[PDB]
Amino acid sequence: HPNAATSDVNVTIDTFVAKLKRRQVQGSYAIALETLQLLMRFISAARWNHVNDLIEQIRDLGNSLEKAHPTAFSCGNVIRRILAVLRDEVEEDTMSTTVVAEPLISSMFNLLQKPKTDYRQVAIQGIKDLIDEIKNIDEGIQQIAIDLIHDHEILLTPTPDSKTVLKFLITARERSNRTFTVLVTEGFPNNTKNAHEFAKKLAQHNIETLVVPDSAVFALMSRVGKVIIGTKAVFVNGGTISSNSGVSSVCECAREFRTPVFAVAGLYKLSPLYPFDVEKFVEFGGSQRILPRMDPRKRLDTVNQITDYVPPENIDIYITNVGGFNPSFIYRIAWDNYKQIDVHL
Amino acid sequence: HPNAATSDVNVTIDTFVAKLKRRQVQGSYAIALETLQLLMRFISAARWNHVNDLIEQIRDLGNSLEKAHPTAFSCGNVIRRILAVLRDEVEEDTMSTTVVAEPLISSMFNLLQKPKTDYRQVAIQGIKDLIDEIKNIDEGIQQIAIDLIHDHEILLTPTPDSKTVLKFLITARERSNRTFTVLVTEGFPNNTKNAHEFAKKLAQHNIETLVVPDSAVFALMSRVGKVIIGTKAVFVNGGTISSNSGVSSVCECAREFRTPVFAVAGLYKLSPLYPFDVEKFVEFGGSQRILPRMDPRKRLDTVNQITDYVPPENIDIYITNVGGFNPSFIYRIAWDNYKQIDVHL
Numbered sequence: 082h083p084n085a086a087t088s089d090v091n092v093t094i095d096t097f098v099a100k101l102k103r104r105q106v107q108g109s110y111a112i113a114l115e116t117l118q119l120l121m122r123f124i125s126a127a128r129w130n131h132v133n134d135l136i137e138q139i140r141d142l143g144n145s146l147e148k149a150h151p152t153a154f155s156c157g158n159v160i161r162r163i164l165a166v167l168r169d170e171v172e173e174d175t176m177s178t179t180v181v182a183e184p185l186i187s188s189m190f191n192l193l194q195k196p197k198t199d200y201r202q203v204a205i206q207g208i209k210d211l212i213d214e215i216k217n218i219d220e221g222i223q224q225i226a227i228d229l230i231h232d233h234e235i236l237l238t239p240t241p242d243s244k245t246v247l248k249f250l251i252t253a254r255e256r257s258n259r260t261f262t263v264l265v266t267e268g269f270p271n272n273t274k275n276a277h278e279f280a281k282k283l284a285q286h287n288i289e290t291l292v293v294p295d296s297a298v299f300a301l302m303s304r305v306g307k308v309i310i311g312t313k314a315v316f317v318n319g320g321t322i323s324s325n326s327g328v329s330s331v332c333e334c335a336r337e338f339r340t341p342v343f344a345v346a347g348l349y350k351l352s353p354l355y356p357f358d359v360e361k362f363v364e365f366g367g368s369q370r371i372l373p374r375m376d377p378r379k380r381l382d383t384v385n386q387i388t389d390y391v392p393p394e395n396i397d398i399y400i401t402n403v404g405g406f407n408p409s410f411i412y413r414i415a416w417d418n419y420k421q422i423d424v425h426l
Numbered sequence: 427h428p429n430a431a432t433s434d435v436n437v438t439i440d441t442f443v444a445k446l447k448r449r450q451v452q453g454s455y456a457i458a459l460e461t462l463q464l465l466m467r468f469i470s471a472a473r474w475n476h477v478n479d480l481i482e483q484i485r486d487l488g489n490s491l492e493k494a495h496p497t498a499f500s501c502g503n504v505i506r507r508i509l510a511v512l513r514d515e516v517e518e519d520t521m522s523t524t525v526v527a528e529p530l531i532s533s534m535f536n537l538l539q540k541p542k543t544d545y546r547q548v549a550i551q552g553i554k555d556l557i558d559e560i561k562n563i564d565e566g567i568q569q570i571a572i573d574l575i576h577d578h579e580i581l582l583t584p585t586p587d588s589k590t591v592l593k594f595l596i597t598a599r600e601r602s603n604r605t606f607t608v609l610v611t612e613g614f615p616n617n618t619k620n621a622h623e624f625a626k627k628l629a630q631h632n633i634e635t636l637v638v639p640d641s642a643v644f645a646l647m648s649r650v651g652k653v654i655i656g657t658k659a660v661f662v663n664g665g666t667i668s669s670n671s672g673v674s675s676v677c678e679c680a681r682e683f684r685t686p687v688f689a690v691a692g693l694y695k696l697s698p699l700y701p702f703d704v705e706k707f708v709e710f711g712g713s714q715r716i717l718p719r720m721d722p723r724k725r726l727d728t729v730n731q732i733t734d735y736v737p738p739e740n741i742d743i744y745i746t747n748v749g750g751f752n753p754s755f756i757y758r759i760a761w762d763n764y765k766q767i768d769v770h771l
Contacts, residue, residue, distance in 0.1 A: 339683055339684065
């Protein structure tokens with residue numbers, strides 16, 4: 082469905098679109114929040130009574146948003162989650178309206194073989210619940226995460242940008258008995274300032290900080306104990322897209338030297354879409370913040386990328402609010418929140 | 427060739443044989459010394475008249491010695507070295523007697539194409555030189571050896587039976603600026619007491635000592651920095667015979683984790699003969715030490731071995747008195763000490 086009725090009924094959709102396209106909005110969490118707000122707006126003002134049609138409309142809306150920005154996934158994910166929440170409720174309702182037990186939580190053969198209420202209030206509650214979840218992830222992570230960090234171990238931290246990862250680190254550091262040394266990679270094109278900020282924050286807490294160039298991975302890796310990455314998007318097979326610059330090579334190095342690789346993950350950040358090719362999913366970066374002047378650029382060709390995709394062969398741990406999970410197992414987790422039908426919208 | 431010619435001229439051969447058989451002589455160095463002494467005795471007493479015949483006799487004697495004891499490699503090696511020493515002198519002499527171009531020190535095409543003096547004194551001197559070489563090995567290692575180990579690094583030590591390895595460790599430990607943690611694997615049926623002794627020595631030296639059982643190698647492997655072998659005999663392609671029990675598995679583990687594997691022995695232990703079979707050269711221990719009783723132990727056939735063989739693929743460094751060498755290079759060193767015809771006797 083095109084934007085014809087969805088302009089005067091709900092106002093800020095255009096603004097959201099603008100934020101998405103021209104990068105006015107910063108941080109995936111913020112984007113998610115915005116999406117939630119939009120959904121709430123859609124719910125409160127508009128009236129439907131018919132449910133399947135509404136669901137279809139919602140799906141269409143999600144799809145359009147996805148098509149608008151091919152590298153922002155959190156927005157999509159949240160919508161998908163909401164749809165999933167709706168669907169189960171709808172299914173429950175149908176059974177009451179009309180008036181079989183499964184071996185596990187879900188059946189396989191049921192896809193092939195033929196199978197006024199306070200619903201609005203429930204829907205409203207759902208959004209609130211989602212918001213709450215988004216707010217408090219660290220409270221669920223803390224009692225699972227601080228179990229594996231030991232004394233006299235050096236920790237390498239690629240991609241330092243997220244407010245969650247920092248918080249996690251700080252919680253660990255609060256326990257002064259647990260000794261750890263932090264190596265911080267700069268990240269040439271985009272991460273630099275952020276990395277510096279992170280370092281400053283560490284200093285403020287009184288944690289031992291070491292500033293690392295992007296080339297110096299091989300020389301330190303023999304001394305590196307555990308590697309913790311702050312990812313933006315999590316996928317089906319295990320692989321992740323991390324928040325810009327120098328992740329793949331580092332992972333490869335880790336694999337070579339046999340190093341345990343931790344990752345800060347989220348259930349709303351987890352995506353049920355599969356990454357088949359490196360050519361499509363990887364977002365490339367600007368040459369403006371590399372070399373000034375454009376007359377030498379006539380012959381020379383600068384190659385640079387923002388967000389970097391990782392193969393599932395390297396990472397081993399995914400610390401969430403529920404717990405730590407294997408990359409060769411995270412699909413199950415996704416399925417416990419998302420459906421196979423709601424993948425291709 | 428029998429011992430019909432040598433009865434009143436040389437008698438000590440029998441004694442040497444006795445020492446070999448019932449293990450009255452202990453430590454390869456001692457064996458080497460004995461061999462040297464025997465050679466000296468042979469030289470001082472016997473008559474020659476001819477040189478080629480004498481050489482042949484020497485070869486025969488060597489063969490006999492080998493037949494008497496195969497696990498005594500040092501004995502063989504020393505003899506070979508002596509032969510090589512003789513040979514060059516003989517070659518030199520021939521050139522004067524008769525009265526040549528070469529790209530390097532030795533040529534391959536010289537084998538394909540058709541080619542009284544005071545040599546006794548030279549031969550005597552050779553023995554002395556060999557003795558001198560045997561005397562000090564550690565002094566020619568320590569200048570290279572105390573350059574590899576660094577601060578806050580962890581060492582793992584299989585085979586503490588060798589006298590050289592301990593000395594090497596001690597020399598490293600002497601330095602006030604250098605600090606390292608030592609993990610020691612025991613070796614149950616052959617190395618236990620020796621291992622304990624080593625540990626005690628380490629304690630005395632005032633270093634942080636960690637006594638580790640043979641099962642607890644895997645758990646500490648994430649912290650292991652370097653691997654050192656207490657080998658007894660070196661060979662052509664790189665493979666080495668180690669001084670009894672608990673070496674192979676550890677080496678394999680190191681290879682798996684890509685941990686650097688060092689080896690310290692010496693060039694007198696180095697042999698120009700190939701270890702084609704593990705079963706032929708490696709000798710087995712005793713069943714009595716493992717388990718008591720005899721009548722039920724007829725049913726319980728126990729397998730236990732003294733010496734251990736490690737493939738050249740795992741080991742990378744062979745630091746000797748001359749300098750640091752590789753398994754891909756050590757063959758040339760052997761050639762520089764033992765001649766082409768002297769390999770087969």
